């Protein structure tokens with residue numbers, strides 16, 4: 001009754017997926033579209049949880065490459081539709097992503113950073129780890145986007 005699919009195989013879901021993400025972290029629709037359009041059959045890849053008929057996008061996560069780690073990825077923008085939270089759908093899509101990374105992508109580790117929901121990831125098997133940057137040296141983070149509450153976690157697949 002539910003499916004998890006890469007967004008690039010079902011672009012008709014992109015508009016609903018943008019609204020899902022933007023309802024949580026407000027950005028332009030175009031900015032979210034650029035991210036969804038980057039999804040491909042390696043990395044990065046956006047996965048969406050939907051109903052059987054694909055008439056509602058229940059959840060979304062994005063898997064991003066890590067410049068210094070060819071056998072790992074970073075998961076970000078994990079969001080479940082506000083109508084359907086607390087019902088196991090976040091757990092569902094995260095477990096699917098882990099199988100997907102291990103089996104389809106042959107990856108060994110998933111990393112993430114969070115500010116307030118490390119208790120969610122701890123419950124589903126993630127562990128705190130040392131800091132790690134998604135980008136390589138050819139990237140400068142805007143200082144206004146740094147936050148002291150950022151905690152890092154990983155799960156060995």
Ligand SMILES: CC(=O)SCCNC(=O)CCNC(=O)[C@H](O)C(C)(C)COP(=O)(O)OP(=O)(O)OC[C@H]1O[C@@H](n2cnc3c(N)ncnc32)[C@H](O)[C@@H]1OP(=O)(O)O
Nearest residue numbers: 077078079080085086087088089090091114117119120123
């Ligand atoms: C890397 C990043 O993207 S961090 C930002 C994470 N995303 C967000 O904050 C966006 C808004 N929030 C959401 O979309 C959702 O609430 C999520 C993704 C945080 C969790 O999805 P949900 O569907 O609501 O959680 P889910 O039903 O699957 O519950 C998983 C378990 O973790 C627990 N749990 C859920 N959220 C939290 C939390 N914030 N803190 C501690 N424990 C939690 C639940 O009790 C549940 O326990 P159980 O396995 O024993 O039944």
